[PDB]
């Protein structure tokens, strides 16, 4: 009868758990060892001899082996304005990503839903996250239609979000699942680099970094509180807290502008240094209340923005080299898939933990941390607990 | 602590309440009676006699008196590519709205925070919503910086959201506030029509509607559970439930595409007809659990997408004339400010209720409903409870 009573019945009881993880990538991929030759050829830039050598050095430093890319050589040959450095091309880019982002997201979601093993009609919420394109209705609507979810799913459409947003969607899903009894949240991060792909220029050296690191992929989760063991629900990880902060003295470190030439990034400031200098304050805030101060006692997931961030955090905290292993494995095999990346690493970690026969989904450890890094500079910190294997 | 104990300690107890409302608009405004002449003059289109007459009649029926617009005659005189029908212009539009959307949002936020009466350091969360431009970092970051909020605010950046999203941010804020003990959510919707303004054409009759109805404004809320009366917190409305659904047979009713020419809308189907046909299903879903079936017993807030929606809903449900008064007032005095509109209407309702000395913030009634309408076609339904005056 009362509002109070309504509220306690309406809400869930326990912590939000990740009940399933599915991933997908375009089948087309490039080996990083071959990418400088390919990139400078298809962008008609082979006369830029010195700049190509610079790009080879950057690609060698990236530690990336393979990247999946929706964009094919055959398609780019028909669309020279996308191969140019700065030609009007946003319409063409939008035409691609407003279709392909939800399509790739659907591939990941189907896999997640199958693992979960419950009826798709049981999904109550959809969180869709991308940095690739915008449209009305959004990608969330298209995913709903493609999957044939109930028309009354509660949707949140997270557009132009950037690299921190794998952590962001965990934070979003956590509150949705925990505040709503029975709620089952389909989370999808889907990224396609057709918005940023362009020809190189010595007037845009930042562009060379993106051209070496960014890649395509999608990851899907089912998130829910109060798992029902009797129908086979089992969490993989449980979320305990999720936080977000802007780093001091970082104003203007990473800007991304959506223009008539597509999405353009601009880098200033020492991003790996800023993150490494500050990350302990986030660890303290997250773990002091839990009585934990040994960062090597944690299982780790960090957004693989590039190798320097990871190397410098490792050095700064004295992490054992094992800690960043799952993060680096994804960077190596997939590149920087923006928001999706930390969700691929979760998948890698729980899969390897099973193969290696250790005691929990978190490399045999109890507590863990997941970091998202993005414009702001923003650092998102999610505290996770493993589950026994 | 166990995870379940941590969870209990981490969350709030009661329903989320709207603790404060503030609004703002660009100073510059246009009277609707004068707009057909002005619009067709400034876009060098006054020789399009038959088209201008079509536009005049649309404005004559719009029931709008006044619309605020950041775009001035002088600015448009200096930027004629904005006045052309479909000229390259996204970059110019972005340059405007990436600044003006958060600035206008800040103005509304300062008013809400003053009414709330608490230190801004107590804001824990920020939800920013717009349909006007995109950027990285987002308007949420810019607002955080402009207001000097704590760097550790938890942010959600809702971009390209559209007309249903005043309801959306209520749905978001409800879960944020209810699931986090002590959380105080700053919600801002800020809309600036510089992204859609363009010259008229008989090849884009759909655009005449937007040109007649869309307007600029921002609204801010403070939302929180567990109000502290000892420091002067008092909810204005309390949220009970928030739902969302896609109407049947409505595919493509409203599409909006962000292109090199800016934002462009395309309309199909009978949107007033679709909503009137389907709205009782949403009312039933929301109120049948509450034992409420008399739609004239509710206080009403409906997104004023245009007058035909409101007229056809009124006729379908047999609503008394008075029910849509607050909605129609905002439409008349401000036009369709997209996502901000319903939040202005909440403000108008609670202010008129106090002026008239009625029993509650919701026109003296206990229960109320707030609808958002947008692309999908999406209908959002928020159940509200008033507070005694």
DSSP assignment of A87-129 equals -S-HHHHHHHHHHHHHHHHHHHHHHHHHHH-S-GGG--EEEEE
Query: Is there a cis peptide before residue A229, judged by omega within 30 degrees of 0?
Result: no
For residue A187, report the phi and psi dihedrals to the nearest 5 degrees.
Answer: -110, 130
Distance, in Å, from the CA atom of B349 to the CA atom of B361, rounded to the nearest integer, reads 7
User: Smallest Cα–Cα separation from B329: which of B354, B358, B357, B300?
Assistant: B300
Q: How far is A192 from chain B (nearest CA, A)?
A: 17
For residue B327, report the phi and psi dihedrals to the nearest 5 degrees.
Answer: -60, -45
Residues A229 and A241 in one domain: no
Residues forming beta bridges with residue A128, ordered by sequence position: A157, A188
B6: burial class by Cβ within 10 Å (0-12, 13-18, 19+)? Answer: middle
Residue of B12, B258, B379 to mutate for A, most A C-beta atoms under 10 A: B258
**Is A168 in Cβ contact with B257 (below 8 Å)?**
no
Residue of B7, B126, B210 to mutate for A, most A C-beta atoms under 10 A: B7
Distance, in Å, from the CA atom of A276 to the CA atom of A304, rounded to the nearest integer, reads 13
A325: burial class by Cβ within 10 Å (0-12, 13-18, 19+)? Answer: middle
Interface of B with A in 53-72 (CB under 8 A): none
Partner residue opposite A152 with nearest CB, options B11, B162, B245: B245
Give the domain-ending residue among A235, A257, A292.
Answer: A235
This structure's resolution (angstroms)? Answer: 1.6
What is the phi-psi region of residue A376: left when phi exceeds 0, alpha when psi lies from -120 to 50, beta otherwise? left
Q: What is the CATH number of the domain that holds A359?
A: 3.40.47.10
Chain A residue numbers with beta carbons less than 8 Å from the beta carbon of B176 are 175
Which residue range is the domain that position B325 belongs to?
236-389
Distances (CA, A) of B312 to B208, B274, B306: 21, 10, 11
Distance, in Å, from the CA atom of A132 to the CA atom of A101, rounded to the nearest integer, reads 7
Residues forming beta bridges with residue B23, ordered by sequence position: B219
Distance, in Å, from the CA atom of A347 to the CA atom of A157, rounded to the nearest integer, reads 23
| A91 shares contact with chain B (CB less than 8 Å) | yes
| B253 shares contact with chain A (CB less than 8 Å) | no
Residues B216 and B247 in one domain: no
Residues B92 and B199 in one domain: yes
Partner residue opposite A138 with nearest CB, options B160, B179, B260: B160
Q: Are A16 and A172 in contact (CB under 8 A)?
A: no
Give the domain-ending residue among B235, B266, B283.
Answer: B235
Residues B58 and B95 in one domain: yes
Q: How far is A88 from chain B (nearest CA, A)?
A: 8
The residues after which chain A has a C–N gap greater than 2.5 Å are: none
Interface of B with A in 288-307 (CB under 8 A): none
Number of domains in chain A: 2
Residues B293 and B346 in one domain: yes
**Is A385 in Cβ contact with B245 (below 8 Å)?**
no
Distance, in Å, from the CA atom of A148 to the CA atom of A145, rounded to the nearest integer, reads 5
Residues A173 and A273 in one domain: no
Residues B229 and B241 in one domain: no
Please report how the helices B165-178 and A165-179 are oriented relative to each other, as an axis angle in degrees rounded to 10. 80
Rg (CA), chain A: 21
Quickly count: other Cβ atoms within 10 Å of residue A38's Cβ: 12
Residue A163 annotated in active site: yes
Q: Are A219 and A343 in contact (CB under 8 A)?
A: yes
Distance, in Å, from the CA atom of B332 to the CA atom of B149, rounded to the nearest integer, reads 35
Strand pairing report for A29-31 and A66-68 = antiparallel
The set of residues, in sequence order, having a beta carbon less than 8 Å from that of B239 and lying 6+ positions away, is B15, B16, B17, B18, B170, B174, B382, B383, B384, B385
Residues B126 and B227 in one domain: yes
Give the domain-ending residue among B177, B202, B235.
Answer: B235
For residue B214, report the phi and psi dihedrals to the nearest 5 degrees.
Answer: -70, 145
| B228 shares contact with chain A (CB less than 8 Å) | no
| B247 shares contact with chain A (CB less than 8 Å) | yes
Strand pairing report for B184-191 and B125-129 = parallel
What is the phi-psi region of residue B291: left when phi exceeds 0, alpha when psi lies from -120 to 50, beta otherwise? left
**Is A160 in Cβ contact with B159 (below 8 Å)?**
yes
CA B91 to chain centre: 25
For residue A278, report the phi and psi dihedrals to the nearest 5 degrees.
Answer: -110, -15
Residues A201 and A250 in one domain: no
Helix (H) or strand (E) holding B376: none
**Is B90 in Cβ contact with A259 (below 8 Å)?**
yes
A291: burial class by Cβ within 10 Å (0-12, 13-18, 19+)? Answer: exposed
Residues A226 and A304 in one domain: no
Residues A157 and A285 in one domain: no
User: Smallest Cα–Cα separation from B208: which of B314, B102, B43, B56?
Assistant: B56
Chain A residue numbers with beta carbons less than 8 Å from the beta carbon of B4 are 13-15
Interface of A with B in 118-157 (CB under 8 A): 131, 134-138, 141, 144, 151-157
Distance, in Å, from the CA atom of B192 to the CA atom of B218, rounded to the nearest integer, reads 9
Chain A residue numbers with beta carbons less than 8 Å from the beta carbon of B140 are none
Helix and strand numbers (H, E) in chain B are 12, 13
For residue B293, report the phi and psi dihedrals to the nearest 5 degrees.
Answer: -130, -10
Residues A170 and A250 in one domain: no
Distance, in Å, from the CA atom of B181 to the CA atom of B194, rounded to the nearest integer, reads 39
The set of residues, in sequence order, having a beta carbon less than 8 Å from that of B82 and lying 6+ positions away, is B71, B76, B89, B92, B93, B194, B197, B198
Distance, in Å, from the CA atom of B344 to the CA atom of B334, rounded to the nearest integer, reads 9
């Amino acid at each position: 009868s009362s509002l109070d009573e309504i509220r306690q019945a309406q809400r869930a009881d326990g912590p939000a758990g990740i009940l399933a993880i599915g991933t997908a990538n375009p089948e087309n991929h490039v080996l990083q060892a071959e990418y400088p030759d390919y990139y400078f050829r298809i962008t008609n830039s082979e006369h830029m001899t010195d700049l190509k050598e610079k790009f080879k050095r950057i690609c060698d430093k990236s530690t990336i082996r393979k990247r999946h890319m929706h964009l094919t050589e055959e398609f780019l040959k028909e669309n020279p304005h996308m191969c140019a450095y700065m030609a009007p091309s946003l319409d063409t880019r939008q035409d691609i990503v407003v279709v392909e982002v939800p399509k790739l997201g659907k591939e990941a979601a189907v896999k997640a839903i199958k693992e979960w093993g419950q009826p798709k009609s049981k999904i109550t919420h959809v969180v869709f996250c991308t940095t690739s394109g915008v449209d009305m209705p959004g990608a969330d609507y298209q995913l709903t239609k493609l999957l044939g979810l109930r028309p009354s799913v509660k949707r949140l459409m997270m557009y132009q979000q950037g690299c921190s947003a794998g952590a962001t969607v965990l934070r979003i899903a956590k509150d949705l699942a925990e505040n709503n009894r029975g709620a089952r949240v389909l989370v999808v991060c889907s990224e396609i680099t057709a918005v940023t792909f362009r020809g190189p220029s010595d007037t845009h050296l930042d562009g060379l970094v993106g051209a070496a690191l960014f890649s395509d992929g999608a990851a899907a989760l089912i998130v829910g509180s109060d798992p029902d063991t009797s129908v086979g629900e089992k969490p993989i990880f449980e979320m305990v807290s999720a936080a977000q902060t802007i780093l001091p003295d970082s104003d203007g470190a990473i800007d991304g502008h959506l223009r008539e030439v597509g999405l353009v990034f601009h880098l200033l400031k020492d991003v790996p240094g800023l993150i490494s200098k500050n990350i302990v304050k986030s660890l303290d805030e997250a773990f002091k209340p839990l009585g934990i101060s040994d960062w090597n006692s944690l299982f780790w997931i960090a957004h693989p923005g590039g190798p320097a961030i990871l190397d410098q955090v490792e050095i700064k905290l004295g992490l054992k080299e094992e800690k960043m292993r799952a993060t680096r494995h994804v960077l190596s095999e997939y590149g920087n898939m923006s928001s999706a990346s930390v969700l691929f690493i979760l998948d890698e970690m729980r899969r390897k933990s099973a193969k290696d026969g250790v005691a929990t989904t978190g490399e045999g450890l109890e507590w863990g941390v997941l970091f998202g890094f993005g414009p702001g500079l923003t650092v998102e910190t999610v505290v996770l607990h493993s589950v026994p294997l």
